[PDB]
Design a protein around this ligand. Sequence first.
Ligand SMILES: N[C@@H](CCC(=O)O)C(=O)O
Ligand SMILES: N[C@@H](CCC(=O)O)C(=O)O
Lengths: 95, 200, 172, 172, 52, 53
Amino acid sequence: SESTNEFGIFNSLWFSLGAFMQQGCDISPRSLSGRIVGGVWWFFTLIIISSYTANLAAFLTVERMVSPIESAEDLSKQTEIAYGTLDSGSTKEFF
Amino acid sequence: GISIMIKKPQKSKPGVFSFLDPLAYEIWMCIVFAYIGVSVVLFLVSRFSPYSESTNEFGIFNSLWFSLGAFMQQGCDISPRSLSGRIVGGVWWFFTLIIISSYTANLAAFLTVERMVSPIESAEDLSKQTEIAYGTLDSGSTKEFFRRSKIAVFDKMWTYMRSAEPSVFVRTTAEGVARVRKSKGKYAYLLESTMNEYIE
Amino acid sequence: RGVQMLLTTVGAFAAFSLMTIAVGTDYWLYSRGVCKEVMTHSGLWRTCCLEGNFKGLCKQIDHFAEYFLRAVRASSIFPILSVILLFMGGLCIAASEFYKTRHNIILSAGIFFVSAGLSNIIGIIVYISANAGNSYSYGWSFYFGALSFIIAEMVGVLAVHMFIDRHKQLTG
Amino acid sequence: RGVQMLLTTVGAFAAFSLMTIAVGTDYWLYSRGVCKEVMTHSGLWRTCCLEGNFKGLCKQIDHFAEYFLRAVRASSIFPILSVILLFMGGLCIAASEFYKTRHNIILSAGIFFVSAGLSNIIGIIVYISANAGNSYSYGWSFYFGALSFIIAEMVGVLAVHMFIDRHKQLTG
Amino acid sequence: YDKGECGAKDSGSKEKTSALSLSNVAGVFYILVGGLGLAMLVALIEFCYKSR
Amino acid sequence: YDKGECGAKDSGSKEKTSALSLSNVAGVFYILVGGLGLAMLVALIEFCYKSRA
Ligand SMILES: N[C@@H](CCC(=O)O)C(=O)O
Ligand SMILES: N[C@@H](CCC(=O)O)C(=O)O
């Protein structure tokens, strides 16, 4: 008698994907454990999406370039930015 | 060199459910009752006789299942047949439409205010900020220097140091540090950088 | 199957009792306050002071365009309505012990219970909208009222399930 | 036909091997540290040093409301239970060479496989949260865990499908 | 001018937001419950029309 | 130099950048998992009913 419903594994992946996007899902669990499972995933997506849109909105409102380095320690860890004193200037002898 | 010293800003550890923080406890509670009521009314009106109750699928449990998915804006498998039921549907739809938008807007605002915090930086604007207080050691050379130097920003610093009471002055490094440690956020201190570099 | 009468007869009296107790007790709110500040407890009608030398001193509540809204809170008539309607609902099934075979005496019980619940909901919303205008928190009456509403709903629903069954079986 | 028994048992075996290796290897995280700063690699139990004179040195990890959550990471119970339940499922389905006709083996092992997989989602979430309580990147054990989970999510569907078909054929 | 004080004129310290109160949305609930109350009435009047 | 004994600072990668941490939404995932955890028992009681009809 098994498989009294459309919910093969393939169709289950399809349904759950359409449920994630807020997209048209025709079939229905019609049954308690399935309906229970359906609910929470909806709430999960609702929060996720709302968070994303909010944060991007904040991101576009204020910008900050961030300086790449600040310290002599960074200058000891140097990637590629070369550096040097003035020549003939006594700081060179000091170094 | 002389240096300014401040308390660490306390680290903003998240709360386990802080995602709820936009919406306040009472609203989260009161949504539940409305969901119940809507489901119950949908049930009752669906199964009152059409003039015979076998004529529609809208039993109590199906009525509870419709409303949850409708609240999520997930659509549904079935739709109420009578005009009376359609009224209920439209009402619940508008209700959710307001809530979800309000939630998103508030959360965005909450993050937005943060970014532009702009915390004290270089602290020379302690000549311009006034909500945050700063101390200096008694008899130390600084206590002459701010009287004895006369550069405009340091003029207004010395005016502050003159005028502010309970005074900016302190007898010892130990209790000045204690004053910063207890007077977290609101208080600051002036000291020799070599001492800060030892302490911190 | 038949027995549902024994169950549905139960809950309405309990919900009524809880609702009247909730209306009838001076413990809706914990707050700062006064009884002519110190930590204080209040109900809908009156205020009594604790946490101090005056402990046990009391006074009646401060009763005092949108102006006309104040009357609804000041009466709190919605709670009273919900209580009275719940009484009427229970009296429906008490009546339907006699005058049998009419059936339609049963029908209104659920309607009364639903409407009483809707009233309770409005009452809560009004009360919060008034009071929220300080580390406050709710007294037990609030939860008793909520629970009363929940039972009134469930009992109404299953009573309607009985009214669905008992008349239908005559109709084939 | 049939050999899906071999495929499903192989899948369970492989996931079990990967999971036990993952629990048993010092390859969860690369980070800076000292086995009391240098590049350092983490087991879930112990902190071990590379890239220096102490290369190959190890020390026991520093384990020290969320007050009670601390024990959740410290016990790492959910990782262990995932292995235990995958072991239960595998060793049960391994018995299906005898004690036949009841088929309880397949259903119970299916539920074991699914719950075993679910457990590691919690384990991962817990660990990734706790470590925030920079410069990081994940070691191979993290991916051996992910792969084990992926295979666990695969194998149970095929086993349930075999149970269904081998039971359903009584309809014809 | 030496007796000036209130740099709060310039918002010298920054407020922080708090959650919306129920009062800021209360309107929608009245609308909802009123709608449901109306929604019941149709069924009774329909049944009385269908009473013959 | 022996006496200095603190030094954890944002390096290699930095917290301050912008993105939401996993911790900032974590609880929802617990809610999800618990939800799925519940639905097993409903089917198990459905068997325990039907298995002796
Ligand atoms: N002012 C320096 C020259 C600049 C330098 O030393 O870099 C001197 O007196 O020698
Ligand atoms: N020891 C420093 C104290 C500096 C100060 O606190 O003003 C001095 O020689 O004056």
